[PDB]
Every structure is written in structure tokens, then in C-alpha cells.
Amino acid sequence: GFKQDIATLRGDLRTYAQDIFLAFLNKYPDEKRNFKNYVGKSDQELKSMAKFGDHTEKVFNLMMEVADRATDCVPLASDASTLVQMKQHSGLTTGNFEKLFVALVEYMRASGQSFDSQSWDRFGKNLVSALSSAGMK
Numbered sequence: 001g002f003k004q005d006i007a008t009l010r011g012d013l014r015t016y017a018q019d020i021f022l023a024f025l026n027k028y029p030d031e032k033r034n035f036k037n038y039v040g041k042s043d044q045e046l047k048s049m050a051k052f053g054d055h056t057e058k059v060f061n062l063m064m065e066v067a068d069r070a071t072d073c074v075p076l077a078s079d080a081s082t083l084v085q086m087k088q089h090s091g092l093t094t095g096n097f098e099k100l101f102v103a104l105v106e107y108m109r110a111s112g113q114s115f116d117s118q119s120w121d122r123f124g125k126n127l128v129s130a131l132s133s134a135g136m137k
């Protein structure tokens with residue numbers, strides 16, 4: 001289930017992180033409004049950009065930590081407040097996070113692997129509820 005999915009994603013995190021984030025940017029092209037350096041670049045070109053690989057993996061690194069600390073797919077309030085208060089997130093609303101978790105769950109449901117797609121769906125909704133509670137618009 002959810003806990004095994006964290007271990008599976010962590011066992012190949014750079015490539016899962018990049019392919020899920022590319023799924024998100026391709027599904028929601030207007031979301032490049034917060035990613036000006038990613039515009040006018042194919043999937044392969046983005047993969048060759050040092051900060052694309054590094055930033056994307058660091059994001060999924062912390063995402064996996066937030067999931068690991070969660071209970072029944074409900075993140076800690078402290079993790080939610082970190083995500084609201086990060087200066088890198090100053091621009092964001094909960095909608096940005098919903099769209100990311102929509103792309104993550106579609107990625108898992110298209111995988112041949114037995115991802116607990118439903119647990120990840122609840123996690124993204126629970127995370128959006130916690131982000132809202134912690135003061136994200």
C-alpha cells in the first residue's frame with residue numbers, strides 16, 4: 001500500500017520525480033507561470049538541465065518525508081506549515097498542489113505497478129486541507 005509506495009518511489013526517486021513532474025507540466029501547461037526557466041523545452045531538454053534534475057529530486061525527497069510522517073495519509077500539521085512558510089512557495093495556492101497530486105495519481109494508475117493509487121489521492125486531498133488550515137490561499 002502507501003508505505004510500500006514510498007519505498008518503491010525512493011528506490012528510483014530522480015526518474016519517478018522527473019516523470020511525475022513532467023506529467024504535471026504537460027497536463028497543466030499554464031503551471032509553467034511559476035517555472036519560467038522550464039519554458040520552450042522538450043522532456044529530454046529539461047532532463048539535461050542541472051536545476052531541473054536537482055530541484056525536482058529535492059521536492060520529491062521532502063514529499064516522501066511528508067508521506068512517511070503521515071498517519072492514514074494525513075500529513076503532520078508541522079509539515080503543512082513548512083510547505084506554506086517556505087519562501088520558494090510565496091506565490092502558490094492549494095490549486096497548484098491539487099494539480100500536482102492529480103498528475104501523480106494518473107501516473108500511478110497508468111503504471112503497470114500496483115501503486116495504492118487511492119491512498120495517494122487521499123494524501124493529496126489531505127495535504128491540500130492541511131495547507132489551507134496552515135494559511136495557504
Ligand code: HEM
Pocket residue numbers: 031034035054055056058059060062063066083088089092096097100
Ligand atoms: C508536496 C508537495 C511539494 C513539496 C514537498 C515541495 C518541496 C519543495 C522543495 C524542497 C523546494 C526546494 C528545491 C531546491 O531548492 O532544490 C521547493 C521549491 C519550489 N517549489 Fe515546491 N514543493 C511541493 C509542491 C510544489 C508545487 C505544487 C509547486 C508549484 C506548482 C511548487 C513550486 C515550487 C517552486 C516554484 C520552487 C522554487 C523554484 C524551483 O525550485 O524550481 N512546489 N519545493
Ligand SMILES: Cc1ccc(O)cc1
Pocket residue numbers: 021051052055056059
Ligand atoms: C514541484 C517542483 C519541481 C521542480 C522544481 O524545480 C520546483 C518545484
